[PDB]
């Protein structure tokens, strides 16, 4: 039911001796075995997740947090991204351009993962058959087929 | 040609109901139930099947002797040779570079 | 069960203090492309297995059948 590939990233628990698996939306350009870095001091490369306040002008990111700790709400679909269009150091805000063109200002502390999401350009292929629609919608929800209300 | 029938009470053919017909000594064709096929153990790193380890159903592994459950290598019945071989390389070389990282740091900061 | 083909060890399991009965079987079988011979089988019933010792030459049968202990109940033929 998702057109974007997932990623299973393992983060070593620092508090206790064990491993924690994490499910990340695979940003296009990431590969298995890549070192995905999370935190303030992370470098600027595709795949890493950083707060918006730590990145300079012109960067596009994805899976950003509406609030500092919901672990990502915005720009999660395939091929979507949000652009950094200015910082607000006063009262620690940052405003960005959503994929729908809406401009929203959020906290500079909320995190976001660098890079666009893989699976873009998916809807450029015509869906052709009814069964292809049936196969697509058999795993998403019961929202197909649609019957006109006039009939 | 003689024709056979099920011996259990399930009348449907599935993976758990596989049937092989055998020539019984009494001169009649009898259906013989076959257990599901075993799958080769797989390496944890490369995913491929690892050689030297007996293949059998999970619960029945508790009966086979250790000679078919442990090769004489490190990471015996979990990893397969080449994965272990480069695991040594990765461990040895990174620790080798780590002290190289340390010695340069002690020199640059001292001359700072 | 299984089959063992060593004479010396076979006597050891006869008085192994768990065998109660034993049987001897005679078969008239063929060989190669020549005349047949006299073939015999010696069977020993253990507690959980049934050992056996096949001998295709009656020459070795004599010294072995006498070697069976008298306390062993043998079902002749």
């Amino acid at each position: 039911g998702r057109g974007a590939p997932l990623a299973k990233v393992v983060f070593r628990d620092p508090y206790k001796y064990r491993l924690r698996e994490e499910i990340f939306i695979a940003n296009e350009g990431v590969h298995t075995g890549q070192f995905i870095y999370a935190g303030k001091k992370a470098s600027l490369n595709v795949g890493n997740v950083l707060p918006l306040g730590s990145v300079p002008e012109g960067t596009i990111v994805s899976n950003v947090e509406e609030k500092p700790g919901d672990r990502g709400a915005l720009a999660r679909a395939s091929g979507n991204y949000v652009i950094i269009i200015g910082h607000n150091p006063d009262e620690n805000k940052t405003r960005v351009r959503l994929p729908s063109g809406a401009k929203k200002v959020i906290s500079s502390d909320a995190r976001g993962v660098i890079g666009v999401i893989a699976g873009g350009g998916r809807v450029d292929k015509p869906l052709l058959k009814a069964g292809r629609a049936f196969h697509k919608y058999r795993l998403k929800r019961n929202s197909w087929p649609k019957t006109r209300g006039v009939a | 040609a003689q024709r056979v029938t099920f011996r259990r009470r399930n009348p449907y053919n599935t993976r758990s109901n596989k049937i092989k017909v055998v020539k019984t000594p009494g001169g009649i064709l009898r259906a013989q139930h076959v257990k599901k096929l075993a799958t080769r153990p797989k390496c944890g790193d490369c995913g491929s099947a690892l050689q030297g380890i007996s293949t059998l159903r999970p619960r029945q592994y508790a009966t086979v002797s250790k000679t078919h459950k442990t090769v004489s290598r490190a990471y015996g019945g979990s990893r397969c040779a080449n994965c272990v071989k480069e695991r040594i390389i990765r461990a040895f070389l990174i620790e080798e570079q780590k002290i190289v990282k340390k010695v340069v740091k002690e020199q640059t900061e001292a001359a700072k | 069960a299984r089959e063992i083909t060593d004479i010396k060890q076979f006597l050891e399991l006869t008085r192994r203090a768990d065998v109660k009965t034993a049987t001897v079987k005679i078969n008239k079988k063929l060989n190669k492309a020549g005349k047949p011979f006299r073939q015999t089988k010696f069977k020993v019933r253990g507690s959980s297995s049934l050992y056996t010792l096949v001998i295709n030459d009656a020459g070795k049968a004599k010294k072995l059948i006498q070697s069976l202990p008298p306390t062993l109940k043998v079902n002749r033929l």
Binding site: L44, I60, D124, K125 | - | -
Partner: protein, 91 residues
Amino acid sequence: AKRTKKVGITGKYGVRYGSSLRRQVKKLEIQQHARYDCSFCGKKTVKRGAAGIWTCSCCKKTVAGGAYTVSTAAAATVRSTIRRLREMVEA
């Protein structure tokens, strides 16, 4: 011998689904099922499995990419934007 004149792979749909829809479908399936070079081993062994997952048959190195292309053109400049934006931090 060029068995079919102009429809190639999309000719399997017979005569249905119009001409442009088949043609537009035709364009994508050419590179969807094509063979790409790998960035880790440099072989013609990159094929698409699942929606947007590109795997290499040799060395098992899977690269995330577009739904129908290893590197979609709309995001090839995204890393160019980031890489051009990285050096200003240092110099």
